[PDB]
Every structure is written in structure tokens, then in C-alpha cells.
Design an enzyme around this catalytic site. Structure first.
Site, PDB file in Angstrom:
ATOM      1  N   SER A  45     100.032  -2.450 -42.805  1.00  0.00           N
ATOM      2  CA  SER A  45     101.420  -2.039 -42.993  1.00  0.00           C
ATOM      3  C   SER A  45     102.416  -2.702 -42.046  1.00  0.00           C
ATOM      4  CB  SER A  45     101.610  -0.528 -42.929  1.00  0.00           C
ATOM      5  OG  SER A  45     101.257   0.095 -44.157  1.00  0.00           O
ATOM      6  N   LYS A  48     105.265  -4.531 -43.746  1.00  0.00           N
ATOM      7  CA  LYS A  48     106.461  -3.861 -44.260  1.00  0.00           C
ATOM      8  C   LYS A  48     107.706  -4.333 -43.546  1.00  0.00           C
ATOM      9  CE  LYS A  48     104.253   0.433 -45.905  1.00  0.00           C
ATOM     10  NZ  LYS A  48     102.997  -0.180 -46.228  1.00  0.00           N
ATOM     11  N   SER A 105     105.562   4.686 -43.399  1.00  0.00           N
ATOM     12  CA  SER A 105     104.472   3.847 -43.865  1.00  0.00           C
ATOM     13  C   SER A 105     104.106   4.151 -45.306  1.00  0.00           C
ATOM     14  CB  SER A 105     103.279   3.855 -42.925  1.00  0.00           C
ATOM     15  OG  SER A 105     102.727   2.522 -42.894  1.00  0.00           O
ATOM     16  N   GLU A 141     100.213  -3.251 -52.186  1.00  0.00           N
ATOM     17  CA  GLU A 141      99.478  -2.077 -51.741  1.00  0.00           C
ATOM     18  C   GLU A 141      98.695  -1.498 -52.911  1.00  0.00           C
ATOM     19  OE1 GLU A 141     100.871  -1.616 -47.646  1.00  0.00           O
ATOM     20  OE2 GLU A 141      99.179  -0.910 -48.839  1.00  0.00           O
ATOM     21  N   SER A 212      97.291   0.106 -40.439  1.00  0.00           N
ATOM     22  CA  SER A 212      95.895   0.461 -40.424  1.00  0.00           C
ATOM     23  C   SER A 212      95.295   0.046 -41.744  1.00  0.00           C
ATOM     24  CB  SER A 212      95.725   1.969 -40.235  1.00  0.00           C
ATOM     25  OG  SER A 212      96.184   2.663 -41.310  1.00  0.00           O
TER      26      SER A 212
HETATM   27  K   LIG Z   1     100.620   2.828 -44.802  1.00  0.00           K
END
Ligand SMILES: [K+]
EC number: 3.5.2.6
Length: 263
Positions: A45, A48, A105, A141, A212
Site C-alpha cells: 500500500s 497509494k 489504506s 488491488e 503490508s
Molecule cells: K491496505
């Protein structure tokens, strides 16, 4: 050469059983400290930040872009969606998606940023446009988190990500109101207190983005305002040999503490 700080990071790494990557830029003197700084790590992440920044760049030429609605459908939910699930069968603005991705997240929110940019390659294209030749986003994702050792997909290096984070948050890769918005978002992160910022003196302030993924991959990228001196940028990436490994945010805190003690 190998510095005392680098030797301490290697000792931390050895005790951890994993693979640690660190890059510091001290903007007081532009000096860098790196540990495995040119090795690749899965971003998870932390990517992002690049996606949100790319949308902010688009917004420099479209004053209303961030207020643009995006439909969230049931099919869009992925594996971790705490904000987007509240808006299924409705809409979120690109600002709302950016805030959700960065501060919570939210993985659905990231997928909407990626789609706004034309797919993973649009994120990579923005990276190249701001001088980052290393970053690559290849997937959406959740599959960008597979974090398989040796797989180049969805990776960067600590050195490249620190340089980019500096340019985005402290430099001129974005317009001034967009830079300020990115910094506001990062400083309001909810997920970071156990990672880099756990290793720093408590009087310091910071903004960060964690990540993570599989292989116990545990990451954080931060912009830091220490008490009394110029800002720092710090990247800490960590990944482990077995697919099911547990997260190790404490390793990131330990790396940050070694870095802070070395200043
Ligand atoms: K995440």
C-alpha cells in the site's frame, strides 16, 4: 564504506530473519543513508502515495476533478475496504477516494485511483514524469500485494522511493496547493503509530503511508519534521522468506530509531 548506522541496520536485519531496506534523506544537508538502497522490495500500500499524487497532478488542470463522483458497486469491493463499503451503490469523490486510500489504506479506493489514471501503467507513467525511473505498478488491488521474492512486479527501491517522496512532499513535483493537500493527507494517516513513527522522539511530527502484504511484507514511507531542524524523508521496507509470515512493524520502528540516533 559501511557506517556504524549501516552496521546497526544489518544487525537488526540479521536478528529479524528477513530483508530490510532503508533510505533516509536529511534535507538539512541533502545527505543520504541507505541500507540495501538499490534492492527491490514489494511496495504494497505504499504505492497509494504515487497514485494519489498522480490524481493531484491531474487536478492541477481540472479545478473540479477532486469533486468528481466515482461509482462504488458491490463488485468493486476487494479485501480491505473500510471506507468504500459504506458507499456501495453510491459514489465517492476523487478527494474522498484519495483520503480513504492514504489515511485508511482502503484498497477499493486505490483501485478507483488506478482506474482514473488508466490502469497500473498510468501510475508508472506519472512516476517517470517526476523523475522516478525505478517505481513500477503492474497490478491492481489486491494482487499487487503478492510480494513474491524475486518478482519485479509492483516494486521499487528504497533510494527511489525516498527521492520521490521528497519531490512530492517537500519539492516541486506538484503544485503548491496539491503538495499541501498531499502533506495534509499523510499527516492524518491513521495506520502509522507502530511503524516508523514508533522509533522517533515523540516531540517530532510526521506524515506516513504504511503497507503490508504477503511474505510478511511490512513497509512505511514518511516525511518527518524533527524538533529544531529541517525535514527528513525516510523509507523502511521489510520482507520475509515465507509467504505466511507475520507483520513486523516493530522492525520498522527499530530501523527508524537507529536512523534517528545516527543524526
Ligand atoms: K491496505
Amino acid at each position: 564504506q559501511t557506517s556504524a548506522v549501516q552496521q546497526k541496520l544489518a544487525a537488526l536485519e540479521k536478528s529479524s530473519g528477513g530483508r530490510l531496506g532503508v533510505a533516509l534523506i536529511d534535507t538539512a544537508d541533502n545527505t543520504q543513508v541507505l541500507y540495501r538502497g538499490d534492492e527491490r522490495f514489494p511496495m504494497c500500500s505504499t504505492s497509494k502515495v504515487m497514485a494519489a499524487a498522480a490524481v493531484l497532478k491531474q487536478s492541477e488542470t481540472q479545478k473540479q476533478l477532486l469533486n468528481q463522483p466515482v461509482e462504488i458497486k458491490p463488485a468493486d469491493l476487494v479485501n480491505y475496504n473500510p471506507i468504500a463499503e459504506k458507499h456501495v451503490n453510491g459514489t465517492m469523490t476523487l478527494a474522498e477516494l484519495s483520503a480513504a486510500a492514504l489515511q485508511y489504506s482502503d484498497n477499493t479506493a486505490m483501485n478507483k485511483l488506478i482506474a482514473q489514471l488508466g490502469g497500473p501503467g498510468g501510475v508508472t507513467a506519472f512516476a517517470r514524469a517526476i523523475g522516478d525511473e525505478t517505481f513500477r505498478l503492474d497490478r491492481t488491488e489486491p494482487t499487487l500485494n503478492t510480494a513474491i521474492p524475486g518478482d519485479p512486479r509492483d516494486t521499487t527501491t528504497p533510494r527511489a522511493m525516498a527521492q520521490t517522496l521528497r519531490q512530492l512532499t517537500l519539492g516541486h513535483a506538484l503544485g503548491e496547493t496539491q503538495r499541501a493537500q498531499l502533506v495534509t493527507w499523510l499527516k492524518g494517516n491513521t495506520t502509522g503509530a507502530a511503524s516508523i513513527r514508533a522509533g522517533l522522539p515523540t516531540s517530532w511530527t510526521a506524515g506516513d503511508k504504511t503497507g503490508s502484504g504477503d511474505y510478511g511484507t511490512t513497509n512505511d514511507i514518511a516525511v518527518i519534521w524533527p524538533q529544531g531542524r529541517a525535514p527528513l524523508v525516510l523509507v523502511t521496507y521489510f520482507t520475509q522468506p515465507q509467504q505466511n509470515a507475520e507483520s513486523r512493524r516493530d522492525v520498522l520502528a527499530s530501523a527508524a530509531r537507529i536512523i534517528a540516533e545516527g543524526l
